Design a protein around this motif. Structure first.
Motif, PDB file in Angstrom:
ATOM      1  N   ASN A 323       0.822  -1.226   0.000  1.00 22.03           N
ATOM      2  CA  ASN A 323       0.000   0.000   0.000  1.00 22.03           C
ATOM      3  C   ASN A 323       0.866   1.292   0.000  1.00 22.03           C
ATOM      4  O   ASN A 323       0.747   2.122   0.885  1.00 22.03           O
ATOM      5  CB  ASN A 323      -0.990  -0.025   1.184  1.00 22.03           C
ATOM      6  N   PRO A 324       1.753   1.431  -0.983  1.00 26.71           N
ATOM      7  CA  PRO A 324       2.639   2.601  -1.052  1.00 26.71           C
ATOM      8  C   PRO A 324       1.849   3.829  -1.522  1.00 26.71           C
ATOM      9  O   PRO A 324       0.696   3.674  -1.947  1.00 26.71           O
ATOM     10  CB  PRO A 324       3.641   2.200  -2.145  1.00 26.71           C
ATOM     11  N   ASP A 325       2.474   5.004  -1.491  1.00 30.61           N
ATOM     12  CA  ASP A 325       1.944   6.189  -2.170  1.00 30.61           C
ATOM     13  C   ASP A 325       2.180   6.141  -3.684  1.00 30.61           C
ATOM     14  O   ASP A 325       1.396   6.707  -4.446  1.00 30.61           O
ATOM     15  CB  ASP A 325       2.587   7.471  -1.610  1.00 30.61           C
ATOM     16  N   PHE A 326       3.259   5.471  -4.108  1.00 27.69           N
ATOM     17  CA  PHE A 326       3.702   5.452  -5.523  1.00 27.69           C
ATOM     18  C   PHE A 326       4.435   4.141  -5.800  1.00 27.69           C
ATOM     19  O   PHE A 326       5.087   3.592  -4.903  1.00 27.69           O
ATOM     20  CB  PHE A 326       4.631   6.662  -5.787  1.00 27.69           C
ATOM     21  N   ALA A 327       4.317   3.647  -7.039  1.00 25.24           N
ATOM     22  CA  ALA A 327       5.092   2.489  -7.527  1.00 25.24           C
ATOM     23  C   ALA A 327       5.399   2.595  -9.027  1.00 25.24           C
ATOM     24  O   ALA A 327       4.610   3.154  -9.800  1.00 25.24           O
ATOM     25  CB  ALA A 327       4.372   1.147  -7.222  1.00 25.24           C
ATOM     26  N   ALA A 328       6.555   2.057  -9.426  1.00 22.94           N
ATOM     27  CA  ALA A 328       6.985   2.085 -10.814  1.00 22.94           C
ATOM     28  C   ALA A 328       7.890   0.892 -11.064  1.00 22.94           C
ATOM     29  O   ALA A 328       8.451   0.323 -10.127  1.00 22.94           O
ATOM     30  CB  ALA A 328       7.728   3.425 -11.131  1.00 22.94           C
ATOM     31  N   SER A 329       8.041   0.535 -12.330  1.00 19.09           N
ATOM     32  CA  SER A 329       8.774  -0.658 -12.714  1.00 19.09           C
ATOM     33  C   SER A 329       9.313  -0.527 -14.131  1.00 19.09           C
ATOM     34  O   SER A 329       8.842   0.313 -14.914  1.00 19.09           O
ATOM     35  CB  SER A 329       7.850  -1.880 -12.603  1.00 19.09           C
ATOM     36  N   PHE A 350       7.088   3.474  -2.860  1.00 14.39           N
ATOM     37  CA  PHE A 350       7.496   4.571  -1.986  1.00 14.39           C
ATOM     38  C   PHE A 350       6.363   5.084  -1.085  1.00 14.39           C
ATOM     39  O   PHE A 350       5.230   5.227  -1.530  1.00 14.39           O
ATOM     40  CB  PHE A 350       8.084   5.719  -2.814  1.00 14.39           C
ATOM     41  N   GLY A 351       6.678   5.324   0.189  1.00 14.63           N
ATOM     42  CA  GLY A 351       5.748   5.989   1.098  1.00 14.63           C
ATOM     43  C   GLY A 351       4.601   5.127   1.613  1.00 14.63           C
ATOM     44  O   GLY A 351       4.715   3.901   1.696  1.00 14.63           O
ATOM     45  N   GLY A 352       3.493   5.780   1.967  1.00 15.59           N
ATOM     46  CA  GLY A 352       2.276   5.100   2.399  1.00 15.59           C
ATOM     47  C   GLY A 352       2.472   4.243   3.641  1.00 15.59           C
ATOM     48  O   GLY A 352       3.003   4.700   4.657  1.00 15.59           O
ATOM     49  N   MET A 401      10.923   3.026   1.630  1.00 15.50           N
ATOM     50  CA  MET A 401      11.039   2.497   0.273  1.00 15.50           C
ATOM     51  C   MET A 401      11.299   0.992   0.160  1.00 15.50           C
ATOM     52  O   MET A 401      12.150   0.453   0.866  1.00 15.50           O
ATOM     53  CB  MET A 401      12.110   3.268  -0.495  1.00 15.50           C
ATOM     54  N   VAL A 402      10.590   0.349  -0.773  1.00 16.53           N
ATOM     55  CA  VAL A 402      10.912  -0.981  -1.271  1.00 16.53           C
ATOM     56  C   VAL A 402      11.535  -0.919  -2.687  1.00 16.53           C
ATOM     57  O   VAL A 402      11.010  -0.232  -3.573  1.00 16.53           O
ATOM     58  CB  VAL A 402       9.653  -1.881  -1.294  1.00 16.53           C
ATOM     59  N   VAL A 403      12.659  -1.614  -2.880  1.00 17.51           N
ATOM     60  CA  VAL A 403      13.255  -1.810  -4.194  1.00 17.51           C
ATOM     61  C   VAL A 403      13.298  -3.322  -4.526  1.00 17.51           C
ATOM     62  O   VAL A 403      13.710  -4.116  -3.685  1.00 17.51           O
ATOM     63  CB  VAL A 403      14.709  -1.261  -4.210  1.00 17.51           C
ATOM     64  N   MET A 404      12.925  -3.701  -5.758  1.00 18.87           N
ATOM     65  CA  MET A 404      13.059  -5.087  -6.244  1.00 18.87           C
ATOM     66  C   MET A 404      13.799  -5.165  -7.572  1.00 18.87           C
ATOM     67  O   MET A 404      13.697  -4.255  -8.403  1.00 18.87           O
ATOM     68  CB  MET A 404      11.677  -5.799  -6.374  1.00 18.87           C
ATOM     69  N   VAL A 405      14.512  -6.276  -7.776  1.00 18.54           N
ATOM     70  CA  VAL A 405      15.199  -6.581  -9.023  1.00 18.54           C
ATOM     71  C   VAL A 405      14.971  -8.089  -9.294  1.00 18.54           C
ATOM     72  O   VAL A 405      15.077  -8.932  -8.373  1.00 18.54           O
ATOM     73  CB  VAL A 405      16.742  -6.264  -8.968  1.00 18.54           C
ATOM     74  N   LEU A 443      10.821   7.704 -10.015  1.00 18.36           N
ATOM     75  CA  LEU A 443      10.627   8.203  -8.647  1.00 18.36           C
ATOM     76  C   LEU A 443      10.999   9.691  -8.506  1.00 18.36           C
ATOM     77  O   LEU A 443      10.306  10.454  -7.828  1.00 18.36           O
ATOM     78  CB  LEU A 443      11.427   7.363  -7.642  1.00 18.36           C
ATOM     79  N   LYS A 444      12.110  10.091  -9.117  1.00 20.77           N
ATOM     80  CA  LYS A 444      12.562  11.492  -9.044  1.00 20.77           C
ATOM     81  C   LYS A 444      11.455  12.443  -9.546  1.00 20.77           C
ATOM     82  O   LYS A 444      11.163  13.466  -8.909  1.00 20.77           O
ATOM     83  CB  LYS A 444      13.857  11.682  -9.840  1.00 20.77           C
ATOM     84  N   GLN A 445      10.816  12.068 -10.658  1.00 22.20           N
ATOM     85  CA  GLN A 445       9.692  12.823 -11.210  1.00 22.20           C
ATOM     86  C   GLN A 445       8.493  12.897 -10.235  1.00 22.20           C
ATOM     87  O   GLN A 445       7.984  13.973  -9.968  1.00 22.20           O
ATOM     88  CB  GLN A 445       9.261  12.225 -12.559  1.00 22.20           C
ATOM     89  N   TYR A 446       8.077  11.755  -9.689  1.00 28.06           N
ATOM     90  CA  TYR A 446       6.986  11.702  -8.701  1.00 28.06           C
ATOM     91  C   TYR A 446       7.260  12.683  -7.544  1.00 28.06           C
ATOM     92  O   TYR A 446       6.383  13.436  -7.117  1.00 28.06           O
ATOM     93  CB  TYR A 446       6.815  10.276  -8.153  1.00 28.06           C
ATOM     94  N   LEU A 447       8.489  12.652  -7.041  1.00 26.22           N
ATOM     95  CA  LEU A 447       8.833  13.366  -5.838  1.00 26.22           C
ATOM     96  C   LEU A 447       8.908  14.862  -6.097  1.00 26.22           C
ATOM     97  O   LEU A 447       8.529  15.660  -5.244  1.00 26.22           O
ATOM     98  CB  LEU A 447      10.158  12.849  -5.273  1.00 26.22           C
ATOM     99  N   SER A 448       9.385  15.229  -7.287  1.00 31.56           N
ATOM    100  CA  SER A 448       9.483  16.631  -7.685  1.00 31.56           C
ATOM    101  C   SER A 448       8.081  17.254  -7.898  1.00 31.56           C
ATOM    102  O   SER A 448       7.836  18.408  -7.505  1.00 31.56           O
ATOM    103  CB  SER A 448      10.345  16.752  -8.950  1.00 31.56           C
TER     104      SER A 448
END
Ligand code: ADP
Ligand code: MG
Length: 462
Positions: A323-329, A350-352, A401-405, A443-448
């Motif tokens: 349940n983050p505020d934002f996610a991208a892949s 990110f967040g949430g 933050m969660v990061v996955m690869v 993420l940089k775009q979301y945060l800005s």
């Protein structure tokens, strides 16, 4: 030298079975991984139940049972599937789940080494009129199946799948948190599966299906010339059903050899186009392989043998579980190394509801299985730690933050047998960093944008 079966018996700590706590965790993995490759690879939404029972308190023996709705096993293949360890690892021509060469057979061998109950199998292939039942052991001395019991029962409308139960020494209190984490992390990148888990304390967890979208399955390919050594050439020759000429062998048994390329390879290697390939000498094989390794004009290894999670499922899984505020892949375009294709995917949340920490939570996957132990030695962990997140808009020293690869390939490079860390191969490290950077820019775009909107409300609204 030693057979894989005999090498395992002497060195189980190098094969995922160093002690009963890890034995219990590894058996659960082997069963779940077989069930997933029996389902989603064949277009079937995986419905999987896992139970673990404490059967002998003082001796700490546990019974592990996994039930699936997959394609089943032809009854005549069952005894060898669970009771005969192969003399080698076969050349990989399709992506599959799992790190260890022995697979479920390591759990079977461990079971017969340390206690007295047989393994229990019930299976029904698609459209079968019967369910076939077995109680089975592997002969620990002979490496062959022992059929203790064999039977069958009338099937019902539409039923197909397999149930396996294995009894082993274990340690639930030690293994518990890592088994829960294994299942959680599988569920994150498999949102089209449904799981039920009942543990030895009687706790039950339900992991519901979130979508019916299944990724395109991997396809079998012929081997790429840069990937085959002399012994593998020998194996290919010995397997032939027909009397091929060397030329015919080159065009029909490999990737990226058409009529013209074969002609060139033959000239370069000093071989007769019409000589029968079963008559190739040891010296002639050596020249072939050396020609392969030197030849500069092959197509890249085909990615048809691989299967991705996909941006849409990665994002869905991250959103539903965290349940983050934002996610991208990102799912990157295919690369290749040492005659094998590879693809990297990456994701961030990110967040949430994600907890505040001083470092990201890092999730590692290889051919669709989570890596759980040895994280600090993994190339993925190194890449994540080395990135400067301030460059990408993270400002506090404390963040959520969660990061996955995910790395997929027909040849995953591991650091050490019995450790769950991907090796720092230069070509792969570079691509993992390129991928993580692609996601971090999102993420940089979301945060800005978020910070712009907050400043606007503060300065322009009453
Ligand atoms: N749950 C299952 N459903 C269908 N087939 C299975 C199942 N479990 C095991 N098998 C079959 O038995 C074979 C041997 O399993 P295993 O020892 O884990 O080797 P691997 O998974 O690497 O092929 C598998 O390749 C598969 O064909
Ligand atoms: Mg397996």
């Amino acid at each position: 030298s030693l057979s894989p079966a005999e090498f395992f018996k002497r060195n189980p700590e190098l094969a995922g079975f160093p002690n009963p706590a890890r034995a219990l965790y590894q058996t659960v993995r082997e069963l779940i991984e077989n069930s997933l490759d029996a389902t989603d690879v064949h277009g079937i939404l995986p419905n999987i139940k896992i139970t673990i029972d404490l059967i002998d308190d003082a001796r700490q023996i546990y019974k592990v049972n996994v039930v699936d709705n997959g394609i089943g096993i032809p009854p005549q293949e069952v005894p060898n599937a669970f009771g005969r360890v192969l003399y080698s690892s076969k050349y990989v021509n399709r992506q599959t789940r799992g790190m260890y060469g022995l697979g479920v057979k390591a759990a079977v061998l461990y079971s017969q080494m340390h206690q007295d109950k047989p393994i229990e199998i019930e299976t029904s292939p698609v459209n079968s009129k019967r369910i076939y039942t077995f109680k089975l052991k592997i002969d620990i001395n002979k490496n062959e199946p022992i059929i203790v019991e064999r039977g069958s029962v009338e099937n019902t409308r539409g039923f197909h799948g397999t149930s396996v139960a294995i009894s082993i020494p274990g340690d639930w209190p030690k293994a518990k948190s890592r088994i829960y984490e294994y299942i959680k992390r599988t569920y994150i990148i498999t949102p089209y599966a449904e799981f039920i888990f009942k543990d030895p304390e009687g706790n039950v967890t339900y992991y519901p299906r979130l979508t019916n979208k299944i990724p395109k399955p991997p396809q079998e390919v012929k081997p790429h010339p840069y990937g085959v050594d002399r012994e593998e050439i020998k194996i290919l020759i010995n397997n032939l059903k027909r009397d091929y000429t060397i030329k015919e062998f080159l065009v029909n048994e490999f990737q990226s050899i058409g009529d013209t390329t074969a002609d060139k390879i033959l000239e370069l290697a000093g071989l007769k186009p019409n000589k029968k390939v079963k008559n190739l000498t040891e010296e002639e094989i050596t020249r072939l392989v050396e020609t392969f390794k030197k030849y500069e004009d092959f197509r890249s290894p085909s990615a048809d043998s691989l299967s991705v999670i996909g941006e849409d499922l990665i994002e869905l899984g991250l959103k539903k579980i965290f349940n983050p505020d934002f996610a991208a892949s990102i799912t990157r375009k295919p690369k290749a190394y040492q005659g094998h294709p590879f693809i990297v995917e990456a994701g961030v949340a990110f967040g949430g509801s994600i907890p505040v920490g001083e470092e990201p939570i890092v999730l590692r996957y290889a051919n669709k299985i989570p890596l759980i132990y040895d994280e600090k030695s993994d190339v993925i962990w190194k890449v994540v730690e080395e990135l400067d997140w301030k460059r990408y808009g993270i400002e506090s020293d404390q963040y959520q933050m969660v990061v996955m690869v995910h790395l997929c390939s027909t040849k995953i490079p591991y650091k050490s047998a019995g450790k769950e860390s991907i090796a720092e191969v230069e070509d792969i490290e570079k691509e993992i960093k390129n991928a993580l950077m692609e996601v971090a820019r999102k993420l940089k775009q979301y945060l800005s944008e978020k910070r712009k909107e907050q400043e606007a409300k503060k300065k322009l609204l009453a």
